[PDB]
Amino acid sequence: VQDAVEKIGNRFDLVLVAARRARQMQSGGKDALVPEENDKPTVIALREIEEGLITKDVLDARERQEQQE
């Protein structure tokens, strides 16, 4: 999780973001932004954070867009 903490900066904020994204994927039904490769939502969310597509700001903006829609 070194890449994830490098991209985020704080371990606790990284845990919060990853947990929120994993809950969205498991319950809401959002599709994975990265290839699954037979991985659980936790590892998928961590990989998405490491790549740089999922952050707190991105999640907040996406939620705002959904609420507007």
Partner: protein
């Protein structure tokens, strides 16, 4: 749902509001139908139905009739669980005083109307009278009137006065009190009086009175008239087996109270004689006291088992009480436990989990997956397949386990590495397979230890386990920052045997293209593993700026080091391998790999080191034998000579030339030098051998003995154990501490006789008993430290302060104990670090010291640097990130919102089990104290200056002469005053002699303002001052141990911080334990939380009381911004026990210890706990304000700001 927890006195109106009915009779259950009877202790009307959605009479016996009360039985049809929430009450015939409010010293009834507890208890046990309404008589309130004296008073006044007796008298005395005017009486009385005892009593009583007026509680409520009754399932009466019943002692206590109250009512009905009524009231008071707190008022009431009954207090308090047994430590589901074995094939993030435990723990997940893929239609079918152990259940288990971390724990959990998250690999058998490299973190060895297994369930828990608790992320010790995954035992032996040099081995002098060629040569039985060769090594250096420079040269090495170079990652020198590798060398390999490569390369390298070490320790064939213990031939000659010289001193004692003590201390030295010489001879014989080189000469080689290799590799063993193996066991201590004159001259190889074995047992038993008591004491110390430091969380990034602590290398003579680089590694600077003799700003402000800046600060040779500290932090709650610095377990700056106090307490308390003028450097000399500085700016030597070869500035060359650890650590942390404190100078001034009055001596100090302060001095004190001399503040008056209190009072915060820091670090360093100073600084900051106000100023604080320092900072800042005058204080030092019981929150204080007085004070004062700490949030079950739960609480605070 809720934000705080208020505590206060329960008025009779409130008690009646809580209750759903009145309990009238002591009957519990019927003996035939086993049904509750009416108005009893288990009544179904008051407390609720026994069966779910039914009633006692059975008329309304289904859910359709919810909320409907039967007319026949009166039982509301609802769930049985309401019986654990419904309360009752008993209307006592006569008032009964609360036992806590009377014997929790100081008594809050005695100190609210100014009357001693002996007098009050004389009134309560119905022995004297007290006047309530004097009226127009000579008597006043509170006067004792003896029974005969009361008859005379009734004779000459009669109806004019009321002089009551018992708890009723207390109640109406407290009724007659007017708190406002009586507090004003305090206020006007304090200024007039001068005595300190009267003033202290007066302010204590004023504080209590003002608390009563502010809280809204009335003193009337101090005495009970209505007694609440607990829900029945909290005091159950249940059938164990075959008609036998199990009850709670609360039932017996309540039965006594009800029976005696009923008897009192009956006696009052019949107009009984006064003596019988009085005795009944006395027993009612005794029974209520035994119900509330048994064993306090008098002798403890015992049951039919001749054991004392357990009351309400005894079960809200203690180690076996509610707090510590059920609210702080809970038995949990989804848990398992098994014996641990070793898995040498595992990786760091993997642990071996048996399939039976995985099946039982992950059962709901298996059910979920079976339903979602449709193999099982419903939950019953899924349970059937799981129980039948079908084939597809195993594939489902291997899909659930795939990416689900599991928490492994070992008891005791001394530090945070005792619980770690692993990825499970499912195995046959019943034992958990553990990676060897984590055993040192668990203090776990495979002789029968068991570990607990916990399965996190929610997504947040899984992310926390994978991101924070993974064994891969936990490779550095939070106590010191050193790696904790360093190899031990077999790995070190294998890497040591592989990296050894043998003279004239097969294949010596060959030239090899690289590591692969060397591996090929050894696998082909061409070159021995210890053959000297020349190998072409390609090597990459990763500089500090990131430069990757590759190079290739021919290095003289061995085959083994060439092979080991295969697993070394790129970016490291070959000089790290081109040597024999003991434990320290491998630790340095891992340390530098982490420093220059990161974490992933480090964990892969650690795994590969482990596999290579295991493989080559296996291939080495190291075996211990009986010919490996080479007993030197000089041992017998040395024993004979020692015996001859002991006989010579034995025939010299009769000459009178020596005393008995001199003979003892000379025979001891004779044998304690024979031991050293035998040990040295054995080591010389065992560590060397003579071999034949290629030329044919005889050459000395380091030995390849099994025991020598075990000791030198550092795997397991040391010099002392070898000396007891093949040399001499040595002198031993008698059970009193004395040393037996005749030592044990035999080793374990040749065996001991009976007496020697007896003497050895004398010390073995002491060792075992001291290990056990040490474990107990260390546990208690760690608990106290955690309970004082549990509230320290990093709450900010920068507190914006300019204060700091200076640091220099530690000097205890002419040698350095620990350098400035070690001290300042990871601490943010406070002021700019100027170049020595220059105005260049070498290191700017607010920078974190990594190894790069450590190399800089070592190269430029600067001695003293100012860095931020936790003690000097200005944060209102907790500390800031910069004042703490680097997180040792992470390697970077501390994150916002992690419990640094708990880490500090665990780091300090973990090693408790292990706790038991010649000149040599060229340079100049100076007077400060005396200092000796080398050519550079480093001060090499420091010595004290007593009351003289060279003067100041004189250059000196080498050789030019000028002329119970754990109890100590606990003593320092509780700030215990020494037996003979060293007197210090309170004020700066001139010493002058007084008059040696009878008993002890007096002195006086003359201040610069002409004041003469009188100083009490014991006669035996060896005064170190002369009259006519101006002494400074804090100067030593009499030599001796220094209490921390007067250092704080007369020197300052930094002085006491340094004193505690080094006097705990000396205990730790003497034993070989490395603990960073930030932890002790955090504990000290928690120990300096309190201050006494001296100047009222414009603040509301009354001088003479203790208040928290943060409250005073807030008030002073507000008053300064308003412009009004601030408040002046004195900062006080409290022990780690008093500070914990003086916390603002009463729930944490009650959960620590001393529950009765904490709850009594909280209830009387009417406190409010805002739930702003770790322990209170643990008790109430919500998120802790640390770690992942930090931000959440912040938002709530934001929601409380708006």
């Amino acid at each position: 749902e809720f934000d705080a927890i208020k505590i206060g006195l329960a008025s009779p109106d409130m008690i009646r509001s809580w209750s759903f009915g009145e309990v009238k009779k002591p009957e519990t259950i019927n003996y035939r139908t086993f049904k509750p009877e009416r108005d009893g202790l288990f009544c179904a009307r008051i407390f609720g139905p026994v069966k779910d959605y039914e009633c006692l009479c059975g008329k309304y016996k289904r859910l359709k009739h919810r909320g409907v009360i039967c007319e026949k039985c009166g039982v509301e049809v609802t769930q049985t669980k309401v019986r654990r929430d419904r309360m009752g009450h008993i209307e006592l015939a006569s008032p009964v005083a609360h036992i806590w409010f009377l014997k929790s010293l100081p008594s809050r009834i005695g100190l609210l109307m100014d009357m001693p507890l002996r007098d009050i208890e004389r009134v309560l046990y119905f022995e004297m009278y007290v006047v309530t309404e004097p009226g127009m008589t000579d008597l006043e309130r509170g006067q004792m009137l003896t029974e005969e004296e009361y008859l005379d008073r009734l004779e000459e006044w009669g109806d004019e006065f009321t002089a009551k007796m018992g708890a009723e008298a207390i109640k109406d005395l407290l009724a007659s009190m007017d708190l406002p005017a009586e507090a004003e009486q305090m206020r006007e009385e304090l200024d007039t009086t001068n005595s300190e005892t009267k003033r202290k009593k007066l302010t204590k009583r004023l504080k209590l009175v003002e608390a009563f007026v502010a809280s809204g509680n009335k003193p009337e409520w101090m005495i009970l008239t209505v007694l609440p009754v607990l829900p029945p399932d909290l005091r159950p009466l249940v059938p164990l087996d075959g008609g036998r019943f199990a009850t709670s002692d609360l039932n017996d206590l309540y039965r006594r109270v009800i029976n005696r109250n009923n008897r009192l009512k009956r006696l009052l009905e019949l107009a009984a004689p006064d003596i019988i009524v009085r005795n009944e009231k006395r027993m009612l008071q005794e029974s209520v006291d035994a119900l509330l707190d048994n064993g306090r008022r008098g002798r403890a009431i015992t049951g039919s088992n001749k054991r004392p009954l357990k009351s309400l207090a005894d079960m809200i308090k203690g180690k076996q009480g509610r707090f510590r047994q059920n609210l702080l430590g809970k038995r949990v589901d989804y848990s398992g436990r098994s014996v641990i074995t070793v898995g040498p094939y595992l990786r760091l993030h993997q642990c071996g989990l048996p399939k039976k435990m995985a099946l039982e723990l992950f059962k709901p997940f298996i059910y979920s997956k079976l339903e979602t893929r449709g193999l099982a239609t419903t939950i019953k079918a899924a349970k059937k397949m799981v129980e039948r152990e079908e084939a597809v259940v195993w594939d489902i288990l291997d899909e659930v386990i795939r990416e689900h971390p599991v928490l492994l724990n070992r008891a005791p959990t001394l530090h945070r590495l005792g619980i770690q998250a692993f990825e499970p690999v499912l195995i046959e058998g019943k034992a958990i397979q553990l990676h060897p490299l984590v055993c040192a973190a668990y203090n776990a060895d495979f002789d029968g230890d068991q570990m607990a297994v916990h399965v996190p369930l929610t997504l947040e828990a899984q992310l926390e386990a994978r991101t924070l608790m993974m064994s891969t992320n936990n490779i550095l010790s939070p106590a010191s920052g050193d790696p904790i995954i360093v190899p031990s035992q077999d790995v070190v032996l294998g890497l040591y045997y592989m990296t050894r040099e043998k003279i004239n081995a097969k294949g010596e002098g060959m030239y090899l293209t690289g590591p692969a060629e060397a591996e090929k040569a050894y696998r082909t039985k061409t070159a021995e593993l210890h053959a000297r060769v020349k190998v072409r090594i390609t090597e990459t250096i990763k500089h500090e700026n990131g430069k990757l420079t590759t190079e290739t040269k021919m290095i003289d090495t061995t085959v083994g080091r060439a092979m080991l170079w295969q697993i070394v990652p790129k970016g490291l020198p070959y000089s790290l391998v081109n040597q024999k590798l003991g434990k320290k060398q491998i630790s340095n390999l891992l340390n530098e790999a982490y420093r220059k490569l990161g974490l992933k390369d480090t964990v892969i390298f650690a795994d590969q080191i482990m596999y290579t070490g295991f493989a080559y320790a296996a291939l080495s064939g190291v075996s211990v034998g009986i010919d490996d213990m080479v007993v030197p031939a000089a041992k017998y000659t040395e024993i004979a000579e020692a015996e001859e010289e002991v006989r010579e001193i034995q025939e010299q004692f009769q000459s009178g030339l020596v005393t008995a003590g001199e003979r003892y201390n000379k025979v001891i030295d004779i044998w304690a030098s024979t031991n050293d010489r035998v040990a040295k001879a054995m080591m010389e014989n065992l560590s060397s051998e003579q071999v034949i080189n290629r030329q044919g000469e005889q050459e000395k080689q380091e030995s390849f003995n099994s025991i020598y290799m075990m000791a030198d590799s550092g795997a397991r063993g040391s010099a002392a154990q070898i000396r007891q193996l093949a040399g001499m066991r040595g002198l031993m201590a008698r059970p009193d501490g004395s040393i037996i004159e005749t030592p044990i001259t035999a080793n374990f190889k040749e065996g001991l006789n009976v007496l020697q074995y007896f003497i050895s047992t004398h010390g073995a038993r002491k060792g075992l008993a001291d290990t056990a008591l040490k474990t107990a004491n260390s546990g208690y110390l760690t608990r106290r430290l955690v309970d004082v430091a549990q509230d320290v969380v990093v709450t900010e990034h920068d507190c914006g302060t300019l204060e700091g602590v200076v640091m220099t290398p530690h000097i205890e003579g002419g040698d350095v104990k620990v350098a400035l680089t070690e001290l300042a590694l990871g601490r943010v600077v406070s002021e700019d670090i100027l170049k020595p003799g220059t105005d260049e700003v070498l290191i700017p402000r607010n920078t974190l010291l990594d190894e790069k800046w450590c190399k800089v600060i070592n190269d430029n040779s600067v001695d003293q640097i100012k860095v931020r500290s936790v003690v000097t932090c200005d944060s209102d709650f907790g500390c800031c990130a910069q004042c703490y610095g680097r997180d040792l377990a992470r390697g970077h700056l501390v994150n916002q919102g992690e419990a640094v106090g708990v880490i500090a307490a665990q780091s300090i308390g973990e090693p408790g089990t292990q706790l038991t003028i010649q000149a040599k450097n060229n340079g100049s000399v100076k007077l400060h104290e005396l200092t000796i500085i080398d050519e550079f700016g480093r001060t090499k030597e420091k010595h004290k200056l007593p009351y003289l070869s060279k003067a100041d500035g004189d250059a000196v060359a080498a050789g030019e002469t000028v002329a119970g650890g754990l109890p100590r650590v606990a003593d320092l942390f509780e700030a215990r005053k020494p037996k003979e404190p060293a007197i210090l100078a309170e004020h700066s001034g001139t010493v002058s002699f007084g008059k040696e009055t009878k008993g002890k001596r007096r002195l006086i100090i003359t201040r610069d303002s002409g004041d003469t302060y009188e100083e009490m001095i014991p006669k035996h004190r060896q005064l170190n001052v002369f009259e006519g001399e101006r002494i400074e503040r804090g100067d030593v008056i009499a030599d001796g141990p220094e209490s921390p209190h007067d250092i704080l009072r007369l020197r300052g915060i930094h002085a006491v911080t340094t004193y505690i820091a080094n006097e705990v670090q000396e205990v730790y360093r003497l034993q070989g334990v490395k603990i960073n100073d930030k932890h002790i600084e955090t504990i000290v900051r928690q120990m300096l939380r309190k201050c006494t106000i001296t100047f009222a100023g414009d603040s509301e604080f009354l001088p003479g009381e203790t208040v928290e320092y943060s409250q005073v900072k807030i008030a002073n800042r507000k008053l300064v911004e308003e412009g009004k005058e601030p408040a002046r204080f004195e900062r006080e030092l409290l022990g780690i026990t008093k500070a914990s019981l003086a916390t603002e929150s009463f729930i944490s204080a009650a959960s620590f210890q001393e529950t009765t007085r904490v709850l009594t004070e909280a209830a009387v004062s009417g406190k409010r706990d805002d739930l702003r700490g770790l322990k209170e949030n643990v008790i109430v079950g919500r998120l802790i304000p640390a770690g992942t739960g930090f931000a959440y609480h912040q938002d709530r605070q934001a929601k409380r700001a708006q």
